[PDB]
Nucleic acid binder design. Structure first.
Lengths: 216, 205, 77, 194
RNA sequence: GCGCGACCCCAGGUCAGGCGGGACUACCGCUGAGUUUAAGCAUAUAAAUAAGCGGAGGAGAAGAAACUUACAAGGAUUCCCCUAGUAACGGCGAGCGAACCGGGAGCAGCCCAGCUUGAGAAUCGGGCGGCUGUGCCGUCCGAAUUGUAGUCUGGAGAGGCG
RNA sequence: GCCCCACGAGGCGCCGUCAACGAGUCGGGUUGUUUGGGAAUGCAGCCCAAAUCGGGCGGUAGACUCCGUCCAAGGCUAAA
RNA sequence: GUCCGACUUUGUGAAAUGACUUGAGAGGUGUAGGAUAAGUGGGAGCCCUCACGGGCGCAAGUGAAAUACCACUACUUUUAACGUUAUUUUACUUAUUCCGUGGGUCGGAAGCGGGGCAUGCCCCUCCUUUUGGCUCCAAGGCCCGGUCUUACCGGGCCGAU
């Protein structure tokens, strides 16, 4: 009945449903899951037609998020400030193998000698660090602080779905709705000229256990 | 004679818009006649009657020195006058003619009343309404006020329209045109009868 | 039932708004009929396909006249 | 105002609703009837009054029937002697609008009355229909009404045939007001193309 | 049936009155050639002229901006001066081809429709009587609420207060 | 020279709520005619077809953003 | 001029057959990998329950990516809804069109005859009829009559559904 109840085509408001107090009803989870935002973007396969950015979300996710970082020297010291488990360049082989339990991936410039070995493997879940998805910087401490706080990566997918975390279900409703709204602004800014009729064509909010409801 | 007969028939044949054919579903004869009995009191002045009244008032006020007459209560009539009363919500009930040669004129009248949620009624006979006013076409007449004595039976009239249209807005023809044609009805009966005989005989034997 | 899907009054508000937007755009950018044909593709394509084609039919105009004429009556007050 | 506002709004939408329904039936009746039908009621009471209507004796509304189509230039299959740039019968169009043509033809028959203005009351596919305002000069009520006493004036005698009517202005290029319209204003023959 | 009023539509050698034709110099519309010119000739030129047709007056048309402009903005309409023999258009050939501004002449401004007489069609025609009569008054029929009388007309205006 | 037409109606000053502003017309396409008017000068036929915090105009077609300028689709009116 | 098409003209709808909104389904087809690894948010939890314990991740294996769960989502492919929209075919009476008249005897039902069909209970679901016939006359006074108001005078109805 979860599928049946919701009407996709009608345009609900952000306050009423989706990123709201209503989300808490869909939340039964033992852990705080991140709730994510979907958008159906008229778009093409190409990178430049892609909607890609990293924005910093105004209000926190209130989540510690594990990035996978293997680094060396002073970069490794900086890593420890905002990440659970400091790793050396030797240890990156575990991530390379199969293990990919991380929201987004970051490496240092210093580390980049070693990272080239891993590079086919990391690409597949799309978690991979890139200069394209700025996660390679000398300012290692500053960036690790930001991602932990609630800096997110935005990347267009293979079937033109767009994504970013927009809260955890546990947060108050006021926090959740503004976190949705920042993404929408970024989508319009980044969007290519070539794209036709409304870049946010559809916007859905979901929970993993719950159903989705369209919000505009 | 040729054109006048065709006009009613052709109303059926062409698809009739949502505003029309809400008409033709008219107030009952019993309801209509008792309405007119209330209006017997309220009847507007004749040419002679108005002129006569001026002489009476002029004499009374000048010589007698009496303060002015009581406020007159009559039906208000004429298109532009009555429609304004619907907007202001002064009119309690308006009685609308079924007829009227520019049909564009009179489609607005129940439409506006329904929109503003003022009760209205459609009665047959533009002439019948006109007789009361002692003129020609009234088209519409209405009661903005009623006497306390008339008030009880006036309630029945208000109920009357929502006792033939206590309904949502039936917007008649979906696509339909026709209404049944004399030749076609006879043809249809013959065709139906042949089909029915065949169908029945397959089941039977 | 359907035509979009689900509700009456909620649906009407959106659909009622869409039609004069299209009318103003066509008038103020000339052309008319053939520019509408291009325009429909560059539109949402649910209500809009049916609604735009309806403008070149009737649209639903007696209903429109009651609202617009009533609003015109409130443009005198 | 009242229904005046509603009927105006209906008549915008020729192809739709009450406007199509009622008038489609009525134009079929008009074909059966002659090209002279005097009527005592205005079809459009809104646009009667926006072209000058006082209901009062001497005022009449009348229906005119003038065909749809192009132009007819006499002697086809015996076609004109001249260079082929002026060879054409149906290619050519009148430069009069048909609103004015209705006035000229109506005024020809009703020479004892004078055209004020005219308006459109639809068409079929081979006839175009107009209702024309004519108001007597010879009746007393017009003279003793100060809002229409200008008509009585001998200058306005047969003004339709001289194209000084509302319809006659529009086809004469007096539709505009300034530049571009400039070669129409007080006459096309004003400078006389010197 | 007969439907008082009336509705809708006919008829009077009908009551009081009105139209045609002329003039057509000049004027206002309509409609419309070719000779000619291009040394030929069709596009073009002649010409939005001649012929054809209708209609008024002593003048007529026009007429108070859905204008011109691009300014410390001009300001209904007409005609003259100028722009102009020019922008433009044109087998870019022959030729064709005006306006805006500027100056002068003359000057003049307005009412209906679209917000309410609703304490009442207050309005109007006709007959009739009287009258000092392009009219006025009484009286009676009739016209007209599918709207007369009307504030008000975009420069505005309706309310209110003084 | 006789009635003063005034306590009416309108005008002026100030204040409010409004501002009703004319459709097969606008506008456009196409065709013919006409224009110096040139991706259409005016005009007409046919075809399509509006809106009223709106509309039209702005001498090169078009979208975009501005700015400026009037208020049609009713009507009268001397003089030069 | 003629021919041909489109549009107005033009009202009514059948079903075929293209297609669009949504809504609901059977499924999910690129190398190795059995295969839903088609691709997405999301992901240490989803679900039944909880002494406990399981489906699927967790693991196993491959590789660019690994699999739970709730929407959803190309592509293979289909169905109700309101109809929407487009091709053609086909049919009705109101536009238009043709023709018939000093608009005549139309149509439908039933009177009255009577027949054929299974003629059966009449036989409806049907077919002929329905005041005139050889016989160069003739058919006109809506007719005599019957009947009622109505003294006669004079008027109706019927005769002739």
């Amino acid at each position: 009945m979860s599928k049946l109840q919701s009407d996709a085509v009608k345009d609900a408001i952000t306050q009423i449903v989706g990123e709201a107090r209503e989300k808490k009803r869909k939340f039964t989870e033992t852990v705080e899951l991140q709730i994510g935002l979907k958008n159906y973007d008229p778009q093409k396969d190409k990178r430049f037609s892609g909607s890609v950015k990293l924005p910093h979300i105004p209000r926190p996710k209130m989540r510690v998020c594990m990035l996978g970082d293997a680094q060396h020297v002073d970069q490794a010291e900086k890593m420890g400030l905002d990440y659970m488990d400091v790793e050396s360049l030797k240890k990156m082989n575990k991530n390379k193998k199969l293990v990919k339990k991380l929201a987004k991936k970051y490496h240092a410039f210093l580390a980049s000698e070693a990272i080239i070995k891993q590079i086919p493997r990391l690409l597949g879940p799309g978690l991979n660090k890139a200069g394209k998805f700025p996660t390679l910087v000398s300012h290692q401490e500053s960036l690790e602080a930001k991602v932990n706080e609630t800096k997110a990566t935005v990347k267009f997918q293979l079937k033109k779905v767009l994504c970013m975390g927009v809260a955890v279900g546990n947060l108050s409703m006021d926090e959740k709705q503004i976190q949705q709204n920042i993404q929408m602004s970024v989508n319009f800014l980044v969007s290519l000229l070539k794209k036709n009729w409304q870049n946010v064509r559809c916007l859905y909010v979901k929970s993993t256990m719950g159903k989705r409801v369209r919000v505009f | 004679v040729r054109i006048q007969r065709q006009r009613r028939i052709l109303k059926q044949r062409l698809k009739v818009p949502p505003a029309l054919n809400q008409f033709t579903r008219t107030l009952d004869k019993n309801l209509a006649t008792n309405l007119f009995k209330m209006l017997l009191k309220y009847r507007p002045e004749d040419k002679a009657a108005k002129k006569e009244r001026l002489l009476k008032r002029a004499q009374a006020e000048a010589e007698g020195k009496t303060v002015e007459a009581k406020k007159p209560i009559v039906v208000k009539y004429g298109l532009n006058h009555v429609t304004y009363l619907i907007e202001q919500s002064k009119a309690q009930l308006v009685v609308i003619a079924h007829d009227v040669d520019p049909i564009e004129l009179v489609v607005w009248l129940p439409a506006l009343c329904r929109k503003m949620e003022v009760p209205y009624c459609i009665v047959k006979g533009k002439a019948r309404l006109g007789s009361i006013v002692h003129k020609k076409t009234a088209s519409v007449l209405c009661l903005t006020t009623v006497k306390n004595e008339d008030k009880l039976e006036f309630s029945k009239i208000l109920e009357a329209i929502k006792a033939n249209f206590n309904d949502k807005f039936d917007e008649v023809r979906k696509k339909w045109g026709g209404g049944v044609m004399g030749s076609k009805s006879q043809a249809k009966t013959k065709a139906r009868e042949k089909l029915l005989a065949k169908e029945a005989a397959q089941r039977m034997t | 039932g359907t035509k979009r899907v689900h509700f009456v009054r909620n649906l009407i508000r959106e659909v009622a708004g869409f039609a004069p937007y299209e009318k103003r755009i066509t008038e103020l950018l000339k052309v008319g009929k053939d520019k509408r044909a291009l325009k429909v593709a560059k539109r949402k394509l649910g209500t809009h396909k049916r609604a735009k084609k309806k403008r070149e039919e009737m649209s639903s105009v007696l209903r429109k006249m009651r609202s617009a004429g009533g609003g015109a009556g409130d443009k005198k007050k | 105002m009242g229904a005046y506002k509603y009927v105006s709004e209906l008549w915008r939408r020729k192809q739709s609703d009450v406007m199509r329904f009622v008038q489609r039936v009525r134009c079929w009746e008009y074909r059966q009837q002659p090209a002279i039908v005097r009527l005592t009621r205005p079809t459009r009471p809104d646009k009667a009054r926006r072209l000058g209507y006082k209901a009062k004796q001497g005022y009449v509304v009348y229906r005119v029937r003038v065909r749809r189509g192009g132009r007819k230039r006499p002697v086809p299959k015996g076609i004109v002697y001249g260079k082929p740039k002026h060879q054409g019968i149906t290619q050519l169009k009148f430069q009069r609008n048909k609103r004015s043509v209705a006035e000229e033809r109506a005024g020809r028959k009703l020479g004892g009355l004078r055209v004020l203005n005219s308006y459109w009351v639809n068409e079929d596919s081979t006839y175009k229909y107009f209702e024309i305002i004519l108001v007597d000069v010879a009746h007393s009520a017009i003279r003793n009404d100060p809002r229409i006493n200008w008509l009585c004036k001998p200058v306005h005698k047969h003004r339709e045939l001289r194209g000084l009517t509302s319809a006659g202005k529009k086809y004469r290029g007096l539709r505009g007001k300034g530049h571009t319209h400039h070669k129409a204003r007080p006459s096309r023959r004003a400078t006389w193309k010197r």
